[PDB]
Amino acid sequence: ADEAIKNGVLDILADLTGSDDVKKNLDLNLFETGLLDSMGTVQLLLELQSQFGVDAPVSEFDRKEWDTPNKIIAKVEQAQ
Numbered sequence: 001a002d003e004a005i006k007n008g009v010l011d012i013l014a015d016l017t018g019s020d021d022v023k024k025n026l027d028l029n030l031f032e033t034g035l036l037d038s039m040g041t042v043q044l045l046l047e048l049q050s051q052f053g054v055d056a057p058v059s060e061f062d063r064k065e066w067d068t069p070n071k072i073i074a075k076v077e078q079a080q
Helices: 003-017 039-048 069-077
Strands: none
Touching (some): 003 069
């Protein structure tokens, strides 16, 4: 279906890290890779709450789900 989401989400991912590593790998630990820190997820959320209008937690989300791009790409699909 909507591919502007899977793309945008990913596009926002590669942009998040700043490398074309996640642009491919669909299991690149955004944490174990050091590509992410914390503020990144916050921002991405801002973008995931605008183009996707997601409603994910922050106080203490499941980094496990926000650890990978796939886990997220799914979290975005399980929000629409």
